[PDB]
Design a protein around this ligand. Structure first.
Ligand SMILES: NC(=O)c1ccc[n+]([C@@H]2O[C@H](COP(=O)([O-])OP(=O)(O)OC[C@H]3O[C@@H](n4cnc5c(N)ncnc54)[C@H](O)[C@@H]3O)[C@@H](O)[C@H]2O)c1
Ligand SMILES: NC(=O)c1ccc[n+]([C@@H]2O[C@H](COP(=O)([O-])OP(=O)(O)OC[C@H]3O[C@@H](n4cnc5c(N)ncnc54)[C@H](O)[C@@H]3O)[C@@H](O)[C@H]2O)c1
Ligand SMILES: NC(=O)c1ccc[n+]([C@@H]2O[C@H](COP(=O)([O-])OP(=O)(O)OC[C@H]3O[C@@H](n4cnc5c(N)ncnc54)[C@H](O)[C@@H]3O)[C@@H](O)[C@H]2O)c1
Lengths: 426, 426, 142
């Protein structure tokens, strides 16, 4: 311990504050009774403020460390599967065969969505973005599932969580099928979480679909690697919304919208344009998309990350998996080889070395999905569908903490009181 | 400015922190730099953390002060109209006749929603809670208005502002009409904002609907009184989702859901049900409702508020408005003597006096709304509808500032790094 | 006696007896049984009528509504004074009622409608249309 005893805040006289010690990472200064004395801190963005105590995910950016209930992301990604990882994130411990089998069975038994929610899909335009459709469908669930909205009832919370974990993939695949004009595919209980997804994504009544083991395993890993990422913007949106008592589905829709957010920029969509609509080592990785990099233009595309200093721990296995996929699909991948030239640039180009634009999990996640024949508009849908369990865990944990209602202060610098006098008459 | 220049935090090294001053209210200690020094606070709920710098609304909870751009709520609720208040909050000043003309004109010519959006309502169950349908349509707006989702684009913010402002009452009236099986009503370019809302809510194609000028003003007042309420939970949600790039339509949808959070909060839902049922001037007004108070659920019933100490400043104009409406609807208000008694019990019961369960603005709004024949299910829809202008202003102020993304810290107290080995074999 | 029929017969053979007055021979039963199964599927447009009812409605009321709407489609078998019409009408009712019933059920709970399968008995096909789901094949317990 350093100065993990206490501390003093002095304005004109002292104020002794406690310091809480964490099991990992930095310890914090307890300031809960401060404002209750008038004294407030100023911190837009909360980068110097701990908003909660959590035991879910630990991250050490400078060390490139990511843990889920104490387990390193690499261990879980390689020796587990999305559902077992979900069980761990939600319960805190790994399941025994009895626990896993129970959980797994409940998840599969609720994959089918109500027949009327499917009617809602047909009211959206065919030209709409799959992500927006997904947010719309998600923010519409509480109208049907009115029987599991109480965040203060464990029964409601557990049913809600299962409804999200079971149904999100089905929704996601449907946002896909509708966008391309193909018929919706029902979930099949005999197929794994990832296999059933790939099926609902690519199945067609014209012939039975064959789920490739390497693709199924690749998908499930994309899910694991996107299951959670600690107190980020999207997760904080789930916690802040739910702190007022907002239903689960409404909190998930907001998490999706937040994870969607950074892609709305005009310069973002314009660069992703060239990344997509362009295919050749002389085309993109040759002073075209490389020279056309102006304001942000990187993390969204798989380069760099504010959380990690030198590398994204999620990229290790994702890069290993990218090899296996590119190798397996071959006759359905070799053309996408430019991934090597994009990676070559991110590691050697001075612009990328200096700005620490290392390929993150999404660089390799993107290459895999593209190779599988999935469009870019569906990538974040799949990441969000994966992150939902993390949202549930953080949301469930926020409630056990007594559902602290987000009621922040403000620094008011507007007009002092003044009288209202308007001579208009419209 | 006494020592409103600086102070010091003492951990292991005496770090100086500038004391930032406001134009009204409390001062704040700028701790935005502590993070870099490895020093972080702990504040679940943010009751001592100024989440931002704001100029929109100011509140002195003990002294019952509520100012919008410096202007007192009483003067706005009596002198101004809803659209002028919208302009004031959004532009920081009362409009010139010309500026008001142009503002009102823009609002009037964007009230009718895209016909494809209208077909979404028809996929929901006729028995859906109008508020769940409202959250559903608003979250579905992004798929249609994909042309104004660039939060960093000034014109997109403007169009999205006018889109939300013009259409919310259109969509809210459609929810009600859908819930009772009556045909949707189209906006009326000749009607005022409040009168148009009433027309869309109550008229049929069967006979001409003439808006009562007294109910027109009463609704205008219910709206002005719900325009904005500073940094509350739902606005904090809107701001947080916004900083993470979420589109304006999703931000407002999150706010709507976060607003009715306590309604389906288990203990609050059942409370509204008991108030809902009886109105026979013999049960409720004679300790039927009073005897049962194991859960508070009071602010929701119009009794009390965490923000103000003695009274709700917004309730001043609403109560006066409330008795006018009742008189206007003279020989029909017989079974509604419970309102005066419930009020009396709130003013004279030692328990209500003790806990300061004063009738808040929503107590009277509820009376005005119930008197108008509007079902209780539409109350929060109406409040969120009016509250939208506040949310839009707050979302905008967060943008113009510096888009400081919500990235709080977490006092980690979970498992230390532990090795993983699958217990299961499935 | 009802006990004899309930124990040693089956709904379709009992139907044959009620309608004809005598028990069927193998030839008569097989003919009747086959005609009943061959008309289990209802017109695609009658199914559209199901979607116009509210999800919250009582299955029985929906059933009455669907039933009192059949003459609008089956306008070719309304004459009660024509044996041809009467026999076709009777078969239409005996074949289609279970399909309608199961659909009033599936609609009320939000599950997809299940088509009749000719390889399943009168009761087995019903249980199937009641409890089947595209998520896996249903197993009809004997
Ligand atoms: N005990 C639990 O953990 C638990 C968890 C979730 C939901 N539920 C309960 O089950 C019902 C939930 O339905 P919902 O919200 O998932 O959808 P839903 O009921 O609105 O619509 C789908 C219908 O299909 C059924 N269904 C879904 N997937 C299926 C599958 N793979 N095979 C067969 N039938 C399938 C569902 O049971 C349901 O009747 C409620 O009664 C709810 O309380 C229970
Ligand atoms: N300059 C602005 O403030 C501003 C504000 C909002 C929208 N817009 C732009 O103008 C167009 C309007 O889009 P939208 O959101 O209104 O369309 P929409 O997709 O919601 O469709 C509604 C259609 O009805 C028209 N409309 C709506 N209310 C009307 C009324 N009361 N009287 C007559 N016509 C009415 C609209 O112009 C539009 O064509 C878009 O291109 C949008 O970008 C501009
Ligand atoms: N000879 C008879 O006893 C007899 C009895 C009933 C109906 N019919 C005749 O058959 C047609 C009646 O159609 P309906 O009133 O039953 O429905 P319908 O024609 O209005 O709609 C269903 C359609 O699916 C067909 N169908 C129904 N069940 C089927 C199954 N199990 N396998 C394959 N196809 C199937 C029907 O023949 C029909 O074309 C008419 O031409 C009618 O005259 C004949």
């Amino acid at each position: 311990a350093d100065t993990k005893a206490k501390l003093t805040l002095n304005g004109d006289t002292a104020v002794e504050l406690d310091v809480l010690k964490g099991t990992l990472g930095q310890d914090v200064i307890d300031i809960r009774t401060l404002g209750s004395k008038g004294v407030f801190t100023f911190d837009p963005g909360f980068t110097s403020t701990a908003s909660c105590e959590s035991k879910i995910t630990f991250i050490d950016g400078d060390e490139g460390i990511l843990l889920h209930r104490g387990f390193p992301i690499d261990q879980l990604a390689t020796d587990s599967n999305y559902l077992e990882v979900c069980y761990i994130l939600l319960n805190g411990e790994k399941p025994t065969q009895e626990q896993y089998d129970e959980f797994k069975t409940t998840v599969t038994l609720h994959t089918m969505i109500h027949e009327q929610i499917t009617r809602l899909f047909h009211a959206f335009r065919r030209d709409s973005h799959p992500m927006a459709v997904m947010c719309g469908i998600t923010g519409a669930l509480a109208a049907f599932y009115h029987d599991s909205l109480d965040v203060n009832n464990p029964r409601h919370r557990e049913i809600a969580a299962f409804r999200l974990l079971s149904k999100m993939p089905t929704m996601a695949a449907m946002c896909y099928k509708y966008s391309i004009g193909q018929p919706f595919v029902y979930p099949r209980n005999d197929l794994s979480y990832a296999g059933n997804f790939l099926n609902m994504m690519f199945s067609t009544p014209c012939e039975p679909y064959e789920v490739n083991p390497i693709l199924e395993r690749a998908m499930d890993r994309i899910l694991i690697l996107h299951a959670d990422h600690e107190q980020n913007a999207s997760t904080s949106t789930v916690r802040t919304a739910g702190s007022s008592g907002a239903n689960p589905f409404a909190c998930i829709a907001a998490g999706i919208a937040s994870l969607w957010g950074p892609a709305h920029g005009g310069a973002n969509e314009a660069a992703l344009k060239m990344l997509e609509e362009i295919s050749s080592v002389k085309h993109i990785p040759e002073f075209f998309r490389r020279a056309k990099d102006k304001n942000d233009s990187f993390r969204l595309m798989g380069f760099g990350h504010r959380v990690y200093k030198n590398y994204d721990p999620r990229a290790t296995v994702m890069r290993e998996t990218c090899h296996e996929v590119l190798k397996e699909l071959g006759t359905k991948d070799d053309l996408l080889e430019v991934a090597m030239e994009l990676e070559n640039i991110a590691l050697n180009d001075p612009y990328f070395i200096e700005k620490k634009l290392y390929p993150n999990v999404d660089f390799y996640s993107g290459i895999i999905l593209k190779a599988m024949g999935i469009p870019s508009s569906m990538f974040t849908v799949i990441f969000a569908m994966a992150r939902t369990v993390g949202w549930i865990a953080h949301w469930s944990e926020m409630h056990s903490d007594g559902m602290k209602i987000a009621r922040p202060r403000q620094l008011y610098t507007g007009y002092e009181k003044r009288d209202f006098k308007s001579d208009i008459k419209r």
